[PDB]
Amino acid sequence: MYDVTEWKHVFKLDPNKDLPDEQLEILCESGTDAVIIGGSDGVTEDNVLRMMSKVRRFLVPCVLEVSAIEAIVPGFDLYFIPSVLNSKNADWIVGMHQKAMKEYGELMSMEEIVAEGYCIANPDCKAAALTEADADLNMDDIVAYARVSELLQLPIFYLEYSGVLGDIEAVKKTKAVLETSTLFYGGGIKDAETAKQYAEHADVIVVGNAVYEDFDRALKTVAAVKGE
Amino acid sequence: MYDVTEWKHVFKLDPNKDLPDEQLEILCESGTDAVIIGGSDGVTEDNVLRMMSKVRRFLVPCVLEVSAIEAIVPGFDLYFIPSVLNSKNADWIVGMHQKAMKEYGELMSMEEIVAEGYCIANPDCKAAALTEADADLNMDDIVAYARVSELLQLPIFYLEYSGVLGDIEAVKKTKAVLETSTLFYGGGIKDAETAKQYAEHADVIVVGNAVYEDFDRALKTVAAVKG
Ligand SMILES: [Cl-]
Ligand SMILES: [Cl-]
Ligand SMILES: [Cl-]
Ligand SMILES: [Cl-]
Ligand SMILES: [Cl-]
Ligand SMILES: [Mg+2]
Ligand SMILES: [Mg+2]
Ligand SMILES: [Mg+2]
Ligand SMILES: [Mg+2]
Ligand SMILES: [Mg+2]
Ligand SMILES: [Mg+2]
Ligand SMILES: [Mg+2]
Ligand SMILES: [Mg+2]
Ligand SMILES: [Mg+2]
Ligand SMILES: [Mg+2]
């Protein structure tokens, strides 16, 4: 009974890192619209399983972003399955999902899945390297990828700048072309000011790295976009 | 836009070939549910333009299957843009859609576009070679591509065997997993008996080059499928 078109803020947590249990409880009770567990590069199923067990008690939706088939774990409310639209490797577009349907077809059928169209626009991050993304893009290239996602009707279009602040103009123009898709933006949001700035254009802002860098400051990103 | 979930039979024409006498008009007035202009790599914008000018005048929906952005031509009722799901080359999955939107965004917006998830299951054909398709597939691979097609929201899953008939069991198993999209089957259908056989599982059967080889026999496939 989830609806990402109602969301405004999500925290994305890296199971490859460690967060104190009190901080994890606080993020879950923060008012964020979802807590997303990033099942990515170097991720292990054991860490995803421990995380699931800790966040599932809260009312907030818990989501697993499936970046590696081996790290899939039952128990989450939603499963986000990325397709890296600007990847030069078919494995990151279709390949890996076909292997998953072939090997875990029954599991996939029992879960609530949401496809994400990713556009990785920071050429210097671990994700661009892993996925061989053609990540050095002009604004018109980004807008064209968003149009591809809007055509395929993927429910989410995720503009990913990882650790850097992306060009706000690119967020605005991407949002301009999206009619049916929900625009998720991630990239350098570390405090209330940046969160507000980007929440003016993105439908949902994603705060992740910041949680491990300056927790109190990152926490304020929720009130920044959902508060009075 | 015309509703592909109500179709049962479509003819797919190669714009590089030409039907004699009034055969094109007979085909377009036959009862088929759509006339799709496809082609095999050597497709040119000029040949697509001439074909458009001929088929547009009939009530039957005319569709351009866009296999090259250089050959997009205005004037069709619907445009199908394939994503070759089993391609080893990203350009055949998302690359072209991106080019079309980057180069012809305004045109794309004015046209009715349908994404089509293709699975080329014949490794020995021009289409597999052109699209770098991993086409030597077991039935479980095909079924898994059909599950992905839906994951990606695609309205059409097109199981393609090009010039030969594909495994009927693959058609049946694919139809079984498609819960929300329409299954098009193309490959080697040239007469009524075979058209009827594959129509028991596919949602839409595509009859292609048989129209050039033996037109009268291929024309009978419409009634075979639709009664
Ligand atoms: Cl593991
Ligand atoms: Cl209709
Ligand atoms: Cl003709
Ligand atoms: Cl007519
Ligand atoms: Cl044929
Ligand atoms: Mg909303
Ligand atoms: Mg284990
Ligand atoms: Mg819960
Ligand atoms: Mg919104
Ligand atoms: Mg029907
Ligand atoms: Mg010309
Ligand atoms: Mg017409
Ligand atoms: Mg008309
Ligand atoms: Mg017209
Ligand atoms: Mg049907």
XYZ file of N, CA, C and O in Angstrom, chain B residues 35-171:
548
model
N -0.648 -2.768 -39.760
C 0.399 -2.984 -40.762
C 1.635 -2.333 -40.168
O 1.632 -1.091 -39.938
N 2.670 -3.124 -39.896
C 3.889 -2.603 -39.278
C 4.966 -2.536 -40.336
O 5.154 -3.482 -41.070
N 5.630 -1.393 -40.444
C 6.717 -1.221 -41.406
C 8.027 -1.485 -40.601
O 8.376 -0.776 -39.624
N 8.742 -2.530 -41.016
C 9.903 -2.941 -40.263
C 11.067 -2.776 -41.173
O 11.457 -1.645 -41.502
N 11.601 -3.906 -41.599
C 12.757 -3.893 -42.493
C 13.921 -4.625 -41.834
O 13.887 -4.941 -40.629
N 14.973 -4.856 -42.614
C 16.116 -5.602 -42.143
C 17.436 -4.859 -42.365
O 18.096 -5.030 -43.382
N 17.785 -4.009 -41.409
C 19.026 -3.228 -41.429
C 19.229 -2.258 -42.581
O 19.562 -1.088 -42.358
N 19.055 -2.734 -43.810
C 19.247 -1.862 -44.954
C 18.163 -0.805 -45.095
O 18.107 -0.104 -46.109
N 17.282 -0.720 -44.101
C 16.183 0.266 -44.090
C 16.653 1.713 -44.338
O 17.607 2.200 -43.733
N 15.954 2.408 -45.222
C 16.307 3.792 -45.547
C 15.127 4.691 -45.255
O 13.989 4.235 -45.289
N 15.394 5.953 -44.942
C 14.351 6.903 -44.701
C 13.507 7.087 -45.949
O 12.309 7.208 -45.865
N 14.096 7.061 -47.143
C 13.276 7.244 -48.316
C 12.286 6.096 -48.541
O 11.143 6.314 -48.974
N 12.734 4.891 -48.293
C 11.813 3.771 -48.503
C 10.724 3.784 -47.440
O 9.577 3.448 -47.764
N 11.065 4.187 -46.225
C 10.023 4.264 -45.186
C 9.013 5.364 -45.572
O 7.814 5.208 -45.374
N 9.490 6.517 -46.082
C 8.580 7.593 -46.508
C 7.608 7.169 -47.591
O 6.411 7.454 -47.532
N 8.099 6.462 -48.603
C 7.216 5.985 -49.645
C 6.191 5.037 -49.043
O 4.999 5.118 -49.403
N 6.645 4.129 -48.158
C 5.676 3.185 -47.554
C 4.631 3.914 -46.737
O 3.433 3.613 -46.785
N 5.062 4.889 -45.981
C 4.109 5.652 -45.164
C 3.036 6.278 -46.049
O 1.831 6.210 -45.737
N 3.453 6.927 -47.132
C 2.509 7.567 -48.020
C 1.476 6.639 -48.623
O 0.362 7.081 -48.947
N 1.805 5.348 -48.692
C 0.861 4.397 -49.229
C -0.073 3.844 -48.131
O -1.286 3.816 -48.267
N 0.480 3.465 -47.011
C -0.384 2.880 -46.003
C -1.213 3.796 -45.155
O -2.218 3.387 -44.598
N -0.817 5.044 -45.068
C -1.531 5.994 -44.207
C -2.995 6.236 -44.599
O -3.805 6.623 -43.742
N -3.334 5.980 -45.849
C -4.671 6.293 -46.334
C -5.738 5.294 -45.921
O -6.895 5.534 -46.193
N -5.330 4.188 -45.331
C -6.313 3.155 -44.931
C -6.701 3.303 -43.466
O -5.993 3.923 -42.671
N -7.831 2.712 -43.077
C -8.237 2.802 -41.671
C -7.349 1.971 -40.771
O -7.184 2.285 -39.596
N -6.816 0.860 -41.294
C -5.983 0.020 -40.439
C -4.830 0.818 -39.794
O -4.204 1.664 -40.462
N -4.527 0.552 -38.519
C -3.430 1.300 -37.910
C -2.118 1.020 -38.629
O -1.822 -0.163 -38.935
N -1.367 2.079 -38.944
C -0.044 1.874 -39.530
C 1.012 2.194 -38.452
O 0.929 3.193 -37.699
N 2.010 1.334 -38.365
C 2.991 1.427 -37.326
C 4.391 1.418 -37.940
O 4.667 0.638 -38.860
N 5.261 2.293 -37.437
C 6.672 2.236 -37.844
C 7.471 1.592 -36.723
O 7.437 2.046 -35.595
N 8.112 0.459 -37.021
C 9.026 -0.098 -36.017
C 10.360 0.597 -36.258
O 10.995 0.435 -37.298
N 10.772 1.398 -35.285
C 11.989 2.200 -35.392
C 13.241 1.425 -35.063
O 13.563 1.307 -33.899
N 13.935 0.966 -36.096
C 15.191 0.216 -35.885
C 16.403 1.092 -36.206
O 17.544 0.632 -36.120
N 16.168 2.325 -36.624
C 17.292 3.247 -36.897
C 16.737 4.650 -36.781
O 15.747 4.914 -37.443
N 17.357 5.557 -36.009
C 16.739 6.865 -35.863
C 16.833 7.663 -37.142
O 16.009 8.537 -37.363
N 17.790 7.329 -38.002
C 17.882 8.039 -39.278
C 16.693 7.763 -40.161
O 16.462 8.491 -41.111
N 15.905 6.739 -39.838
C 14.788 6.431 -40.690
C 13.446 6.759 -40.049
O 12.396 6.255 -40.530
N 13.435 7.576 -39.008
C 12.153 7.951 -38.439
C 11.494 8.886 -39.446
O 12.157 9.760 -40.057
N 10.207 8.709 -39.630
C 9.451 9.503 -40.574
C 8.113 9.816 -39.939
O 7.470 8.902 -39.385
N 7.656 11.072 -40.008
C 6.352 11.446 -39.440
C 5.215 10.810 -40.278
O 5.422 10.471 -41.414
N 4.028 10.673 -39.700
C 2.929 10.210 -40.495
C 2.302 8.909 -40.121
O 1.238 8.572 -40.674
N 2.949 8.177 -39.221
C 2.376 6.898 -38.803
C 1.473 7.021 -37.611
O 1.543 7.986 -36.827
N 0.578 6.064 -37.483
C -0.304 6.125 -36.343
C 0.403 5.843 -35.006
O 0.081 6.451 -33.974
N 1.356 4.924 -35.014
C 2.068 4.502 -33.793
C 3.495 4.220 -34.211
O 3.751 3.827 -35.375
N 4.393 4.390 -33.251
C 5.810 4.093 -33.474
C 6.199 3.115 -32.383
O 5.976 3.350 -31.177
N 6.787 1.994 -32.827
C 7.247 1.009 -31.843
C 8.771 1.171 -31.760
O 9.456 1.144 -32.799
N 9.284 1.317 -30.540
C 10.736 1.462 -30.411
C 11.213 0.234 -29.672
O 10.885 0.027 -28.484
N 11.994 -0.620 -30.350
C 12.449 -1.825 -29.649
C 13.563 -1.655 -28.685
O 14.459 -0.830 -28.884
N 13.495 -2.419 -27.605
C 14.619 -2.540 -26.676
C 14.958 -4.039 -26.814
O 14.105 -4.891 -26.448
N 16.148 -4.375 -27.331
C 16.495 -5.789 -27.550
C 17.064 -6.277 -26.194
O 18.224 -6.028 -25.817
N 16.177 -6.927 -25.451
C 16.512 -7.222 -24.072
C 17.708 -8.110 -23.899
O 18.396 -8.006 -22.862
N 17.906 -9.004 -24.876
C 19.034 -9.907 -24.784
C 20.259 -9.444 -25.590
O 21.156 -10.224 -25.896
N 20.294 -8.152 -25.931
C 21.465 -7.629 -26.635
C 22.670 -7.475 -25.682
O 22.502 -7.129 -24.521
N 23.862 -7.751 -26.202
C 25.091 -7.547 -25.432
C 25.521 -6.080 -25.580
O 26.521 -5.652 -24.969
N 24.795 -5.294 -26.356
C 25.184 -3.897 -26.619
C 24.128 -2.943 -26.059
O 22.956 -2.951 -26.487
N 24.512 -2.139 -25.075
C 23.554 -1.184 -24.512
C 22.895 -0.289 -25.539
O 21.752 0.213 -25.326
N 23.546 -0.039 -26.682
C 22.870 0.829 -27.645
C 21.544 0.310 -28.182
O 20.698 1.093 -28.575
N 21.398 -1.018 -28.195
C 20.184 -1.635 -28.626
C 19.151 -1.795 -27.507
O 18.047 -2.234 -27.783
N 19.521 -1.425 -26.269
C 18.562 -1.538 -25.167
C 17.988 -0.190 -24.829
O 16.771 -0.056 -24.791
N 18.854 0.788 -24.608
C 18.415 2.149 -24.248
C 19.068 3.216 -25.143
O 18.469 4.265 -25.338
N 20.269 2.943 -25.663
C 20.970 3.928 -26.484
C 20.175 4.681 -27.553
O 20.234 5.917 -27.634
N 19.417 3.954 -28.361
C 18.637 4.551 -29.440
C 17.456 5.360 -28.942
O 17.077 6.386 -29.541
N 16.833 4.892 -27.875
C 15.711 5.633 -27.309
C 16.283 6.991 -26.886
O 15.619 8.020 -27.069
N 17.486 6.976 -26.296
C 18.107 8.191 -25.775
C 18.463 9.093 -26.923
O 18.322 10.300 -26.793
N 18.902 8.504 -28.043
C 19.305 9.332 -29.206
C 18.092 10.015 -29.778
O 18.141 11.223 -30.066
N 17.019 9.246 -29.917
C 15.768 9.739 -30.439
C 15.271 10.868 -29.574
O 14.755 11.861 -30.086
N 15.427 10.733 -28.248
C 14.897 11.806 -27.410
C 15.820 12.994 -27.435
O 15.346 14.116 -27.303
N 17.106 12.756 -27.579
C 18.054 13.874 -27.573
C 17.991 14.618 -28.903
O 17.995 15.853 -28.938
N 17.925 13.871 -29.983
C 17.915 14.518 -31.311
C 16.573 14.947 -31.827
O 16.477 15.951 -32.563
N 15.541 14.202 -31.458
C 14.181 14.463 -31.961
C 13.145 14.523 -30.872
O 12.047 14.005 -31.039
N 13.503 15.159 -29.763
C 12.571 15.244 -28.648
C 11.213 15.836 -28.972
O 10.161 15.361 -28.469
N 11.193 16.846 -29.826
C 9.940 17.511 -30.145
C 9.075 16.582 -30.992
O 7.852 16.459 -30.790
N 9.710 15.907 -31.923
C 8.976 14.974 -32.745
C 8.441 13.811 -31.893
O 7.295 13.415 -32.039
N 9.272 13.278 -31.003
C 8.810 12.180 -30.154
C 7.556 12.542 -29.367
O 6.609 11.772 -29.266
N 7.531 13.758 -28.845
C 6.399 14.215 -28.062
C 5.131 14.275 -28.895
O 4.054 14.016 -28.380
N 5.234 14.620 -30.170
C 4.033 14.745 -30.968
C 3.498 13.409 -31.490
O 2.347 13.307 -31.931
N 4.334 12.397 -31.425
C 3.923 11.076 -31.902
C 3.509 10.123 -30.820
O 3.777 10.317 -29.623
N 2.791 9.076 -31.196
C 2.388 8.051 -30.176
C 3.462 6.966 -30.226
O 3.615 6.321 -31.258
N 4.164 6.791 -29.112
C 5.327 5.885 -29.067
C 5.038 4.773 -28.097
O 4.527 4.998 -26.983
N 5.415 3.569 -28.490
C 5.210 2.389 -27.658
C 6.564 1.659 -27.522
O 7.216 1.377 -28.531
N 6.963 1.351 -26.295
C 8.214 0.640 -26.125
C 7.899 -0.841 -26.284
O 6.910 -1.376 -25.769
N 8.775 -1.511 -26.968
C 8.582 -2.913 -27.239
C 9.792 -3.717 -26.693
O 10.935 -3.429 -27.089
N 9.598 -4.674 -25.781
C 10.691 -5.488 -25.274
C 10.921 -6.707 -26.187
O 10.157 -7.675 -26.161
N 12.017 -6.708 -26.919
C 12.291 -7.771 -27.846
C 13.136 -8.795 -27.246
O 13.995 -8.519 -26.414
N 12.897 -10.047 -27.654
C 13.763 -11.153 -27.257
C 14.023 -11.895 -28.586
O 13.111 -12.550 -29.158
N 15.249 -11.755 -29.118
C 15.581 -12.451 -30.366
C 16.110 -13.818 -29.945
O 17.199 -13.948 -29.363
N 15.315 -14.849 -30.256
C 15.631 -16.196 -29.802
C 16.185 -17.106 -30.876
O 16.338 -18.293 -30.668
N 16.505 -16.523 -32.014
C 17.109 -17.269 -33.167
C 18.523 -16.700 -33.284
O 18.691 -15.534 -33.704
N 19.534 -17.480 -32.956
C 20.898 -16.966 -33.056
C 21.433 -16.915 -34.451
O 22.488 -16.286 -34.686
N 20.740 -17.553 -35.380
C 21.220 -17.579 -36.744
C 20.399 -16.702 -37.709
O 19.783 -17.162 -38.657
N 20.457 -15.387 -37.469
C 19.722 -14.482 -38.314
C 20.355 -13.116 -38.300
O 21.131 -12.819 -37.383
N 20.032 -12.355 -39.337
C 20.563 -10.975 -39.487
C 20.267 -10.139 -38.246
O 21.136 -9.423 -37.791
N 19.076 -10.280 -37.663
C 18.709 -9.437 -36.530
C 19.595 -9.730 -35.338
O 20.010 -8.823 -34.621
N 19.906 -10.995 -35.086
C 20.756 -11.307 -33.969
C 22.128 -10.792 -34.181
O 22.780 -10.332 -33.257
N 22.616 -10.868 -35.417
C 23.965 -10.382 -35.662
C 24.037 -8.850 -35.504
O 24.953 -8.335 -34.821
N 23.047 -8.159 -36.063
C 23.000 -6.698 -36.031
C 22.945 -6.162 -34.614
O 23.660 -5.194 -34.259
N 22.155 -6.814 -33.777
C 21.942 -6.339 -32.413
C 22.845 -6.983 -31.342
O 22.630 -6.775 -30.127
N 23.850 -7.753 -31.771
C 24.736 -8.461 -30.884
C 23.893 -9.229 -29.838
O 24.205 -9.265 -28.638
N 22.838 -9.899 -30.294
C 21.990 -10.595 -29.334
C 22.568 -11.923 -28.834
O 23.211 -12.649 -29.587
N 22.352 -12.204 -27.542
C 22.766 -13.492 -26.932
C 21.467 -14.258 -27.183
O 20.552 -14.307 -26.348
N 21.440 -14.905 -28.350
C 20.237 -15.552 -28.825
C 20.093 -17.021 -28.770
O 19.051 -17.523 -29.198
N 21.127 -17.712 -28.313
C 21.086 -19.165 -28.193
C 20.600 -19.335 -26.753
O 21.390 -19.397 -25.808
N 19.281 -19.391 -26.616
C 18.648 -19.411 -25.302
C 17.856 -20.641 -24.997
O 17.235 -21.243 -25.897
N 17.871 -20.998 -23.713
C 17.088 -22.134 -23.195
C 15.725 -21.539 -22.840
O 15.613 -20.304 -22.634
N 14.692 -22.377 -22.696
C 13.372 -21.821 -22.395
C 13.375 -21.014 -21.093
O 12.708 -19.979 -21.020
N 14.124 -21.448 -20.081
C 14.098 -20.653 -18.858
C 14.703 -19.258 -19.060
O 14.322 -18.315 -18.373
N 15.626 -19.127 -20.008
C 16.182 -17.793 -20.287
C 15.111 -16.905 -20.910
O 14.981 -15.729 -20.552
N 14.361 -17.456 -21.843
C 13.330 -16.704 -22.527
C 12.259 -16.238 -21.541
O 11.830 -15.065 -21.545
N 11.832 -17.176 -20.689
C 10.828 -16.866 -19.689
C 11.340 -15.757 -18.751
O 10.586 -14.850 -18.412
N 12.607 -15.806 -18.381
C 13.174 -14.787 -17.517
C 13.211 -13.422 -18.217
O 12.899 -12.397 -17.570
N 13.502 -13.401 -19.541
C 13.452 -12.112 -20.279
C 12.027 -11.559 -20.317
O 11.813 -10.369 -20.222
N 11.032 -12.414 -20.429
C 9.653 -11.991 -20.416
C 9.355 -11.383 -19.016
O 8.664 -10.359 -18.940
N 9.847 -12.022 -17.935
C 9.609 -11.434 -16.616
C 10.251 -10.054 -16.490
O 9.670 -9.135 -15.823
N 11.432 -9.881 -17.087
C 12.104 -8.587 -17.046
C 11.306 -7.556 -17.841
O 11.112 -6.429 -17.364
N 10.829 -7.945 -19.032
C 10.086 -7.017 -19.893
C 9.029 -6.368 -19.047
O 8.863 -5.128 -19.067
N 8.302 -7.161 -18.282
C 7.318 -6.546 -17.432
C 7.922 -5.707 -16.293
O 7.395 -4.641 -15.952
N 9.031 -6.161 -15.712
C 9.673 -5.380 -14.659
C 9.895 -3.974 -15.217
O 9.718 -2.963 -14.503
N 10.304 -3.902 -16.488
C 10.574 -2.624 -17.112
C 9.375 -1.889 -17.620
O 9.536 -0.895 -18.360
N 8.179 -2.370 -17.256
C 6.937 -1.751 -17.646
C 6.457 -1.875 -19.136
O 5.329 -1.422 -19.522
N 7.204 -2.639 -19.928
C 6.895 -2.665 -21.375
C 5.531 -3.201 -21.823
O 5.136 -4.332 -21.506
N 4.816 -2.442 -22.673
C 3.488 -2.910 -23.109
C 3.485 -4.132 -24.002
O 2.501 -4.855 -24.071
N 4.563 -4.283 -24.744
C 4.724 -5.405 -25.671
C 5.976 -6.218 -25.399
O 7.023 -5.655 -25.108
N 5.839 -7.544 -25.412
C 7.041 -8.421 -25.348
C 6.978 -9.115 -26.733
O 5.985 -9.741 -27.094
N 8.021 -8.969 -27.529
C 8.037 -9.505 -28.877
C 9.059 -10.638 -28.947
O 10.260 -10.391 -28.832
N 8.570 -11.873 -29.146
C 9.465 -13.032 -29.221
C 9.706 -13.251 -30.705
O 8.779 -13.538 -31.455
N 10.978 -13.065 -31.122
C 11.364 -13.055 -32.506
C 12.270 -14.190 -32.941
O 13.348 -14.372 -32.380
N 11.815 -14.927 -33.949
C 12.639 -15.975 -34.535
C 12.944 -15.681 -36.010
O 13.562 -16.506 -36.678
N 12.558 -14.504 -36.506
C 12.838 -14.071 -37.871
C 12.375 -15.037 -38.972
O 11.172 -15.199 -39.104
N 13.291 -15.662 -39.716
C 12.881 -16.517 -40.822
C 12.504 -17.955 -40.541
O 12.230 -18.665 -41.492
N 12.460 -18.370 -39.280
C 12.043 -19.744 -38.970
C 11.013 -19.763 -37.876
O 10.821 -18.773 -37.171
N 10.298 -20.862 -37.774
C 9.356 -21.059 -36.713
C 10.054 -21.347 -35.404
O 10.943 -22.228 -35.351
N 9.632 -20.674 -34.319
C 10.260 -20.912 -33.031
C 9.528 -22.020 -32.285
O 8.461 -22.416 -32.649
N 10.141 -22.449 -31.204
C 9.612 -23.473 -30.306
C 8.241 -23.054 -29.762
O 8.111 -22.061 -29.069
N 7.208 -23.807 -30.112
C 5.873 -23.516 -29.673
C 5.759 -23.525 -28.138
O 5.032 -22.736 -27.537
N 6.558 -24.380 -27.506
C 6.549 -24.476 -26.063
C 7.081 -23.169 -25.463
O 6.669 -22.780 -24.376
N 7.977 -22.501 -26.170
C 8.511 -21.233 -25.633
C 7.413 -20.197 -25.675
O 7.325 -19.306 -24.822
N 6.600 -20.251 -26.706
C 5.515 -19.280 -26.805
C 4.506 -19.472 -25.674
O 4.037 -18.552 -25.046
